[model samples]
Target: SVEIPGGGTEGYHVLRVQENSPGHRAGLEPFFDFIVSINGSRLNKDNDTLKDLLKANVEKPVKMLIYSSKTLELREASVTPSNLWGGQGLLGVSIRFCSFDGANENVWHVLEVESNSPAALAGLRPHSDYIIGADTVMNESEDLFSLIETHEAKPLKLYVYNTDTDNCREVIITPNSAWGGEGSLGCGIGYGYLHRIPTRPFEEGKKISL
Candidate 1:
């Protein structure tokens, strides 16, 4: 179901409309990908929290500041907690919307890829960069797991951006799935830890405004 904040038929863009439950079940697929603009505001990638908060129970909505990949799309969906048998109830997914080609945007910086894992055998080398796409993952926002949803993949495309080079590039890797699993590759990202701003710098703020 397309649950947008405020009572209106505006804003909110649908990416994918799944069959059964909510959206498809409600015959809302036609309205899929439509911009959601409610009240006097239009729903955008940023401030999509309203949708997350609107969910009956599970996952928070993800929002973005701009729309670069403008298109309404859909894919298969499933939900299960980490410890389903342990009675953990439904899995809680958090959505964080971001643009790949935005200035000072919050992007996924690959930290590290496991060794001897499916990624390694796929010609994935250490220090390589990765921009995990939805096809590679399954989550509220960035789906990093979708890449391994099924096995037998070759020549995977690893997208990366080098700060030193200030360039965006893609690399192709061969797949070496261990017995029917995904090829293994090791890659690292650049998302660093957040730290408090130094107080000394703020104390030296100059008094000037335009």
Candidate 2:
């Protein structure tokens, strides 16, 4: 129940937690969790707090306050960074800067879906879910339009992000203009800044892989 400064919306994202490493053993779920603070020092906007902390505490236990994005939970874990971890770093975890708000990721939002359309039949949720990755994986995908054109009668595979259930799943639909729909897919696709979604390493959400 401690208050996290910075509105509890910004921190270092756990990019990876290697197996058998201290962070992994301590139950750090990579991607879905953010390193809110190390020890009692909450992260600032741009203080670069983790480096000095790591350098000064080699082989010593460090208390980490972590935030889980998926569950919206905050908890602490203990780790010690040591060269003896047998690989590279002591904790076997990697992180990068991140924030909780803003759509910074490259994905299309489901603005709307037409009745009896391919998108509707495929079970795409309008205004609730967004496109995760598709075909070769892209946005405004110089290729999405191209793919839609070329695969006109074929099933174009898509990895969609479902915020409602907080899960990821693959959606396959055939793009055809003959279906009496508005567009090739009969769904309004949202993209770019106004539609920005934060990027996360796929491993974190733990859904149907690719």
Candidate 3:
């Protein structure tokens, strides 16, 4: 099942699509794409809403209205679910209940940065500085919440990009709940579909655009 939105909304965001699966065949884009409606029935934040719809159309063709990642438009696509595919899931795709698709390629928006938190100590600018990743690894498949959780109480080396200065630099911050701050990281990270991190810092001679 897809991850549901915390705000309680209809539709779900595509997290991952299995290779050669119906979702992949249909060209569903992960992270940036969303499923708004299925079989002419509007979806909701509830998983059961999608579950019932799929169950009714099991082994049958289902038409869906998908929010395209490119052009940010809605369009139609057809998919069929069947047990004969030898896959565990009905659609061979993983999803989460996120009804929003506010994404920028290779850019992650920072919603907010808390005071006296690790982010603040690290000089994490609020509403700026796109967080590329911690260290050299970037997990686009996993959401920010889970990714941060994995590194709890551990130092996270982040690669941050600032559009103002056109610079990408590294910043290290350790997340811990004992800091007496509100959240673990004390920062609000927004969602986005990042293609990849720049191999190196944004040097003038380097091809840093990603």
Candidate 4:
């Protein structure tokens, strides 16, 4: 695929798609090999090629070509900037159809679980992927703002599909707000880490809310 000449701010070759953001909801999974093209211009290796396309307002039907060794499937969806109190950006879900690869299958892992949130309350332990919330599942591939719009970060019923037991259980977990503003949830994502993980506890004091 072709890319914008000198448009890449960082060299591309994505390893992970950040959580609670737009790309994830669209089913842009981590470690997926993507070749982004915009306005008929081929994209460079930098993931920024796609980011720049989204950030800029160009012609209608701005296109992105993201391919994975797995089959690619995407449903159309629109994302809007937020205005509600403590709202992040809201991009509704767009499930993808694709086969899992060795990378995705390698680890049945739980990367993180928030402290004092709903997940922590219901005998739910962190670092386990066996069970995850509906919101988390949807937002797993998306960013916080997009996640909030579809469903407020509340205790969501999770229908756990466990092959071992051949049974399912409903578990609910609430998501903490990324902000400390009035009614703010108290967890903020950092862009340096592509906002995937929470900012360090020591850095929490330095964060401010709008």
Best by lDDT: 2
Q: Rate the local accuracy (lDDT) of all candidates.
A: 0.36, 0.71, 0.66, 0.37
| Candidate 1 lDDT tens digits, 1-210 | 423334433334333433332333323322112433322244544674445433433342222221222122222232321222233222222223332232123334554567655544443334433342332343233333344333235545544444344334454554454544333334443442421111123546688779
Clashing pairs for predicted structure model 3, backbone only: 2-95, 2-96, 3-95, 3-96, 3-97, 4-97, 5-97
Sort by TM-score, best first: 2, 3, 1, 4
Q: In TM-score terms, which candidate is top?
A: 2
Cα-lDDT of candidate 2: 0.71
State every prediction's TM-score relative to the real structure. 0.29, 0.50, 0.49, 0.28
lDDT of 2 at 11: 84
How many residue-pair clashes does candidate 2 contain? Answer: 5
Candidate 1 accuracy as lDDT: 0.36
Model 3 bad stretches (over 4 Å): 1-10, 104-106, 109-210
- TM-score, predicted candidate 3 vs. hidden true structure: 0.49
Worst lDDT window (10 residues) for model 2?
135-144
Residue pairs whose backbone atoms clash in candidate 2: 82-90, 103-196, 103-197, 104-197, 105-197
